[model samples]
Target: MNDHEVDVLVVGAGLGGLSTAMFLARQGVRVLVVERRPGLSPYPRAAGQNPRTMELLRIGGVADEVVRADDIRGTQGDFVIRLAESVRGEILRTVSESFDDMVAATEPCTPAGWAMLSQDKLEPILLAQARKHGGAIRFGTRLLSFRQHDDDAGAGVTARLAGPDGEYDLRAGYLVGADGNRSLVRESLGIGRYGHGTLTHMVGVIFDADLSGIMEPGTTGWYYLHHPEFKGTFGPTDRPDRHTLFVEYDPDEGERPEDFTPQRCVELIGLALDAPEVKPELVDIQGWEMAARIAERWREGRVFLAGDAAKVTPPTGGMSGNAAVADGFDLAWKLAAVLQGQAGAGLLDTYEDERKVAAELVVAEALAIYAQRMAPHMAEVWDKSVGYPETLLGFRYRSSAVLATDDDPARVENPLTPSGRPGFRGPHVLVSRHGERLSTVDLFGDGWTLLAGELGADWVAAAEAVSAELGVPVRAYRVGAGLTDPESAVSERYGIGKAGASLVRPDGIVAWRTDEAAADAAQTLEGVLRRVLDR
Candidate 1:
């Protein structure tokens, strides 16, 4: 006997859970999100939004709003990262010259750019979109406990909750443990994390002050401070008058969070600014640990671990939150596919196989950034791999969901020079549809997309027949026919002949491809789809 029922029950309201809820809701899945917090995040945590995140948000229909939020903040121009004594003082080393350079670098790989909106601002946007898409959310709701039924017992989750009204029980087909690092669902599932423990303890200071003299407008970026007295970081916020500062403390050295009192925080601010007389309004200061860890497992039974619940990376790289949003998107698409009877339950298992490896990649990249920005000593033990762009958009997935051609162990490849192989993101190329120029990336995100060559009408007809027989919505397009690839880059970039085709999943991943036309197109395509979807 349950009080309510939904297709999926999400356990947090952060980027991870909110994004999952939003995506699931958009897919017409009945998703419910419950949060213990009474309201959205008040603090501006997880500020940087990468291009890949922007792409996902675009799919969720909030990319424009996020960019508008940045515009409203009057935050423009490329971000600059550097090590300096103070905002106005001498610069020690220039880590990155400008985000413009990075954008120019990734122009060929993606059309969606980056944004600099805070998580607090972004969460409300996501919540609104989720709610607009028929996602029900309850705040001030604590998930007391949850029990997963066995396969023979219907394979669902019955969650008990304590909320504003009272305790109640609700049932759902699946549950997402998007709760933070200290996830109750993960703990209940007995999942343990493994990585380099705590790197350092930080005291985050959010303050409002006049920075017109120190840092100019539109010059927003994270700054690493190597002060003689104490090492810290200073950065900008959406509000021109508000800023954030973080000072590191050592627990092993008997230094505690209480040591940084309001007065001491003021002193640290003054020292960081090189302005002894400047007064700052202290809004809030909280202590947190900078750690890197990935859960031993991402899934147990019907419950899935996402966001910080699945992996915790240092903030140095700003990839933790981005990865969390990606996790939400990945889980939503896969879960919705299974719940809607479009894919087999075995498709659900690929979430761990794919996201766990992604978690490992993100953790490694964050550790590399942590070593470079905060702890140089860490470089001795770090295992650095590909560069930032590769890690951001070029990471590949290996699971039953994706058919592989080779056993290439390389986790990432250069997105700019895409191989268009299975398990990798489909390359972005210019294609015209009904006389309007667009991108191949734009052709994805709705459902399974099949891109066939100019002369691959046989494959297109095969896709239609397969979709009709399997009850799957496979939207197939033929380049140089209905959609014109003016430069003929689609064939070369996608690595297919005029007689072959490529199949792209809903999340924009190339599931399978053939360089030559098959003898039996419909049967062959059906078999591949069946295997990829675990039918």
Candidate 2:
């Protein structure tokens, strides 16, 4: 039976789906993204994109647009902690610091940092860029069902899409479910989730007002206000007139969103801001469930789940969309390699293998702040060193994609330590390539990159030969010659010897590394490819 064919079919157009589609299309894969919503939501769902996600967007060439769309300027975000009158309330205690301070705390983690574009503003940039890369996105469509077929040779999945007019059948190598908490794909897969079930529900009210008078006194990005009468957080929406205010309600209290009308919203926001003198016009309001859940599994057959679908994180770290985008980055590249015929199908298994566990830590961390059920003393326990930064950049893949070794004594028993350990994020070092200074990070993605030293000439030739053999694009560059690493010990930076080399995966991660030169470079790399690709 003939069906519309594509390399990958993405089942949502939120951050995760768009992220995967954009990454895939950039790698020359035909990807289709279907969203049930007619268009982007008028209300900003996700608050902002984090630094790690910003770096990923930069790699995909949309960071500048996101920045332009952001209301928060660089590193200047303030978490205004207050117990005052309301939005017009008095500032109680001030704990303000520039976000850049944290960025600098972890130097070279990424040259690109955070942006404050809400999902509403961010999705359009993602849509535009995905189209620029030739991605197929259809709005007002729904994915009915998808089935994986191992019987059909290389015919990975077949799905039915119900659009505005009618339904159509489609065949693709892989399917991604970016549908949120009530994911039909996840339900069809029978994936269960576990964790702090629900802490509270909240109403996010979007409004337009002259809060510039109230906030200009300090101009903090966020104001957390509390009074005996009302409590919530108020913030900007990248426009002078636009603002978002959130108020909590105990589900047990039977608080309904309908009770919060435009007139009532003006009072709550005024209570939160303590600005009773000023009346704000409410645009819209959305109800949010704050839950901390990690999916029992991240994938089923050829169908994979991401964003709030795969697992739900607490609003504490504001990591729901950020984590989802990270998943998109990981899943899309692996799918690309497989579709491009460069890697084995098993490479896709890492999607579940890695992110499922990695996200649990984030969920728990966020819960530490939100869930009151935990023992108060549990908060004081610092045995784990609070892996905030590590949570994002230091997760390691246990799947066959990562080549494991204990050669470096510094290589810890745990890969979660935030260092330039092989499985962790490739360290950022500046180097001049063809007379232009570029980050070591810039060379990754779109293809495998072999960062070798001058003595590894054979490694370069072997990579080219294998690229043709495996149909994977592998580019090899000598680190200390035209690409000048003044440190001279280029491999040393990667925890390898000067004669050794590191193979960076297309997702800008170290897939494999050798601390010493191999007796036969091509023979060794041929085997590395087999093991790393599950060949």
Candidate 3:
């Protein structure tokens, strides 16, 4: 058996795992990723890439590739849910808002727009970039057994794996389990999950056929059928000839995939489309369960649970994969900082502190949306519907990691309130640097950025001083001081005065801001960094 060592070991090559590898490797962190499957699943799954997820992908420079994927299909921001009696049958109603009008809502706040690329198409893009980032992408590898040595000398995590060759031991500084709901790592750690514990079985069938005849080019992407015989959603794929449908089945009735013979599957498609003459040539089918559950703990010592392992919610409002992508984006930079010795172990605690809440909030919101769709007779559970914009932009963090200097020390994000509030996402404003126009978000993710207004030379020096002392990156850019934003609009949007400064986290969340310049900027910043990084 051969032994291996790495800074981080990711168990699963799904979106969460690959994205974590990307985020870490992009930051110059060494990461090794392993997958049990022989290769990526060819089934086209998970299409709704939200706006905030695209924003983070832009950090890794893959957002443009997804947008320019297929010139006609790549242009984003088209959202519509069409309800119909059958595929070629009468359209009952369409829950589509003006996407052109919707773009105006986020253009001012985000550097990238939303997308709808499926897993089959999206995985190649992620795998290529992740491999390019110096990670060992081991396929046909299974985690046989593992242990997290929280109390041993040189405490980290070690796992025995069985791969194409033989059994080997992997010693990793940290372990991330993005291994889906049936997570072996989570099970090994004895981490229990809770939520709507009961799960409903689901089947997704992908097939190819001519769907261009009746469907208009501008038709909504999704068609939710409410027929009594069979209820499901049918949507178009990147190919005009390919399509997929999802249907919930009764496990108690002994329904299984094998029972879904090609003929039987064709019948369901005809029932969904209400067109018996049109037949679909079956390509592939995948079965899953619809469960909304969150783990009891996100981390156990140096090992952390992410993606479907942490939570598995129904695909309501299309936030399942979006949440997983956000999970990696949130924890990756923090893990990189801690592993590089730039931050303390306590900084790792904030991962669960921040992401547990994020997972819980999204799961709850998905359950709410699920109820509204599956059982409309139930009372509305949410005060306001948690829409896409709210799930992506309006979400806020309330934790010890966030140093809130404005409003309440424990203020949460209000999706309805897009203003720059501490513990929330810093607003997206346009700025210029060296004759180039950029968004304020373009300055985040590499490290803690200090946005300094006029009279902020002290802040610049303070950032350099703290960065040198702590060995972490802290960049300070002064607005209206020979740099971008001559009108001071960026400063105003961030709620910083002419002489004040705002310290933003690597993930673009506003950590702390002083409305006025401090007499001793270095001393003040040092204190804040010590607290923020748990030094």
For every model shown, the clashing-pair count is 0, 14, 1
**Model 2, span 1-535: residue lDDT tens:** 5543887899988888988888888888899999998887856777677667876888888878877765544234443333344545456554334555545544555566667777878888877888898998989999999778874555578888899899988898778899888998899899898876876688889888876676645465565555677556667666667778888776677788888887788878767765677787878888887777778888877888988898887676567788888888988888877776677878888888777766876776666644222123545432333455656655555557877664452212232223445566676777878788877777776578888766777788889988887777888888766578876645666766667788988777788887678998988988898778867
C-alpha RMSD in Å of predicted model 2 compared with the true structure = 3.5
Worst lDDT run of 10 residues, candidate 2, spans 409-418
Q: Candidate 1, residue 3: CA error in Å?
A: 10
Q: What does the lDDT come to for candidate 3?
A: 0.77
lDDT of 2 at 448: 86
**Model 3: per-residue lDDT, tens digit, 159-245?**
889998999998888899999889998888899998776546767888987866666556646777777887678877777678888
What's the lDDT for residue 535 in model 1? 88
Which of candidates 2 and 3 reaches a greater lDDT? 3
Which ranges of candidate 3 are over 4 A from the true structure?
1-4, 71-79, 89-93, 97-102, 150-152, 251-259, 379-384, 405-417
lDDT per residue as tens, model 1, 1-535: 3323798999999999999999999988999999999988878889878888988898888987888775213356557888887766788888767887757778889988778778888888898998999999999999999988987777799999999999999898899999999999899888889998787899999998887776666566778888888888988777878888999998999999999999999999998888865789999999999888889998878889999999889888778789999999999999988877889999988999999999888888888887787777768788964778888889899999899889999999999899999988899898889988888998888888999987889999998999998878899999888898778888888888888899999888899998888898899999999998888
Local distance difference test, candidate 1: 0.87
TM-score of each: 0.97, 0.89, 0.92
- Compare the candidates by lDDT and give the number of the best one: 1
Q: What C-alpha lDDT, on a 0 to 100 scale, does residue 47 get in candidate 1?
A: 81
Minimum summed lDDT over a 10-residue window in model 1 is located at: 69-78
